[PDB]
Amino acid sequence: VETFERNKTIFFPGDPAERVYFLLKGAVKLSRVYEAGEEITVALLRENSVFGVLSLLTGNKSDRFYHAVAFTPVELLSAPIEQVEQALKENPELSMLMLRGLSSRILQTEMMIETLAHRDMGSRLVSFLLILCRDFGVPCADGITIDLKLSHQAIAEAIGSTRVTVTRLLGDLREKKMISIHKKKITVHKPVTLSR
DNA sequence: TGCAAAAAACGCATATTCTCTATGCAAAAAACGCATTAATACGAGAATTTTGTAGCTACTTATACAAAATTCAGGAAAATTTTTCTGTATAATGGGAGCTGTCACGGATGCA
Numbered sequence: 422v423e424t425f426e427r428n429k430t431i432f433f434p435g436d437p438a439e440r441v442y443f444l445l446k447g448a449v450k451l452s453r454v455y456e457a458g459e460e461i462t463v464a465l466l467r468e469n470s471v472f473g474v475l476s477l478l479t480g481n482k483s484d485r486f487y488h489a490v491a492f493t494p495v496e497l498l499s500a501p502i503e504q505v506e507q508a509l510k511e512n513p514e515l516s517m518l519m520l521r522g523l524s525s526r527i528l529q530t531e532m533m534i535e536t537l538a539h540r541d542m543g544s545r546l547v548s549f550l551l552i553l554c555r556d557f558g559v560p561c562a563d564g565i566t567i568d569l570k571l572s573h574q575a576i577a578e579a580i581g582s583t584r585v586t587v588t589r590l591l592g593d594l595r596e597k598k599m600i601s602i603h604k605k606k607i608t609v610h611k612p613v614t615l616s617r
Numbered sequence: 618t619g620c621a622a623a624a625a626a627c628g629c630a631t632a633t634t635c636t637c638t639a640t641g642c643a644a645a646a647a648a649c650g651c652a653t654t655a656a657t658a659c660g661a662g663a664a665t666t667t668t669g670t671a672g673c674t675a676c677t678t679a680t681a682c683a684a685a686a687t688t689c690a691g692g693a694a695a696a697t698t699t700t701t702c703t704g705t706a707t708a709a710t711g712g713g714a715g716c717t718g719t720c721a722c723g724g725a726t727g728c729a
Binding site for chain 1: 676
């Protein structure tokens with residue numbers, strides 16, 4: 422079942438990602454692209470949604486122009502336009518799910534979309550951490566734990582910080598012990614805290 | 618089977634007369650004018666007022682030292698398999714396997 426780790430290349434320029442990526446699990450992201458570039462988690466998929474997104478544009482040869490990779494050993498299918506094909510033509514069985522797919526990944530980002538559009542990025546970080554680091558693990562070191570080990574330059578890549586939102590922002594959070602270098606727990610003791 | 622010929626029909630004498638072509642009536646449409654009212658637009662007033670421009674200020678980042686806390690490449694033991702070397706003590710005493718049906722040529726020797 423289609424199952425992808427980090428440090429990869431999943432979409433490309435031009436992809437045929439039509440026949441389903443069919444993402445089932447990750448805790449992770451659609452990096453996108455286009456020309457100016459920014460292959461950013463310009464969407465996401467954790468466990469519980471599914472691709473089939475620009476794969477369902479003009480379809481198997483649209484102008485499919487993204488590129489994504491994980492940090493999770495993503496989980497995602499072993500079939501072609503069949504399980505979807507049911508889902509597409511023969512009914513709304515997983516047709517509503519097809520629509521849901523967009524409303525479960527595009528619209529998922531849509532929320533982060535009206536929120537990533539803020540001045541300081543710390544907000545986007547706190548939001549992101551409010552949903553993920555908190556929930557699907559236990560708020561360990563100093564509170565709503567980073568729910569994994571990543572990097573302090575994570576922000577430096579997530580949003581593309583320039584060794585600036587790093588040590589400075591970290592500094593602030595080091596001052597309010599809402600951080601934990603150890604196993605990258607880095608976090609407020611309480612979810613509401615930085616969520617204000 | 619030639620007509621001469623008669624009576625009734627079928628053709629030159631008008632009543633009838635009745636579709637017929639022909640003007641004045643009349644009734645209600647219509648449209649034109651008296652026109653009235655109201656509404657569509659001009660005049661003034663000062664009110665909001667957004668945009669356009671300056672300086673201050675907060676965020677954001679350009680950059681210069683380097684061993685962060687972690688990755689990796691050899692170095693040198695084992696660990697087990699495998700490899701090479703050395704050794705095991707009655708008697709044992711000359712080796713099989715086809716060539717024998719090709720025609721013709723060119724030296725090269727042996728053999729009296």
